[PDB]
Amino acid sequence: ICGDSTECSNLLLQYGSFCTQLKRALTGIAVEQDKNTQEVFAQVKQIYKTPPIKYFGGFNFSQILPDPSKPSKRSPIEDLLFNKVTLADAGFIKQYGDCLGDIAARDLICAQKFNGLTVLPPLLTDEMIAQYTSALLAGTITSGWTFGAGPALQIPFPMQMAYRFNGIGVTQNVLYENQKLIANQFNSAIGKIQDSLSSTPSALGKLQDVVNHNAQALNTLVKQLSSKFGAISSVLNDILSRLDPPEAEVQIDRLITGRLQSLQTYVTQQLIRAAEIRASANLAATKMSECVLGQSKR
């Protein structure tokens, strides 16, 4: 609102706790997003390690198991998904010299950080989420749904996959007589997934629109500073240098109410989007326990 103005921030305190209310709302969303990721990936307490890759009845999980050949210990599928979504600002540390000079590039992060708009990094990094994914993956392939309800009970995958058919209404002899056919159809289907994601870049549009709406909301918030809410200028330093303090308070008050309305509009939209993300997070958390940690008849 002020931007290092000495005359400003003295009338802003006279409005009350509008700054504190908007601050608690943003911090409320920040602690909420950390809870959303926690309730989805941290459903289990034991970090199960996959054994040395052996003959899993003919099923090839190399595309989903973590590959130590590349850093961050994630699967080639997660490598592709990580490249499709481009984060505008991951919230990590940025050097002070990165903004000084070379401003010709599309570095809108420096413009918003100079006005008090900064992005906080998430609590659980991508490496920890990958370990939670590998733990859930190594558990279901070596123990089925037993590790979700209690202790991990080892069981061969062909026998585990046999009881999968028993749940939907297919006898166990069907799988044991067509084990090679099911393994080939499974490996061919997994290979088709990575080809569809790499050829069609519009597959992750849902996750892409999330970072785009947040980046656009921050960009439109900076442009509101250039607005003249009934004042003679948009710069507070110019109003103080041109008009007298008795008259400048009228012009500054118009800018304060204009920028306060812009901030309350941004926070209100963030609270609505947070409800939508939490609804998807609760859906993903329920879908995680009902589809990965077990077999659902829904």
């Binding site: 290092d4 601050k23 911090t27 008090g116 003679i232 240098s241 041109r242 008009l243 007298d244 008259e247």
Partner: protein
């Protein structure tokens, strides 16, 4: 005094629970000097307009172009008491601190 008292004042309470519980404040580096760099010039011919015997007509109002000078508007205050000294874009005491 200390960050504990600062977060106490921020929370408006004498007892603080475990954790950050709030954002304390924001770091702002202040200035240490001043750099007034305006231009370099000679005085302004304000005597050609104020210390004049006869002005022009209303329909033939003369416009005097002013440039390349240090406009010291303080020399105008010591004249006769003006009937109306009203500025519509600035304050009369702020002309000496601005460029045109």
């Amino acid at each position: 005094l200390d960050p504990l008292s600062e977060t106490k004042c921020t929370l408006k309470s004498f007892t603080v629970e475990k954790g950050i519980y709030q954002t304390s404040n924001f770091r702002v580096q202040p200035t240490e000097s001043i750099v007034r760099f305006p231009n370099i010039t000679n005085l302004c011919p304000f005597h050609e307009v104020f210390n004049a015997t006869t002005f022009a007509s209303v329909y033939a109002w003369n416009r005097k172009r002013i440039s390349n000078c240090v406009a010291d508007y303080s020399v105008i205050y010591n004249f006769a008491p003006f009937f109306a000294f009203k500025c519509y874009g600035v304050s009369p005491t702020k002309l000496n601190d601005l460029c045109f």
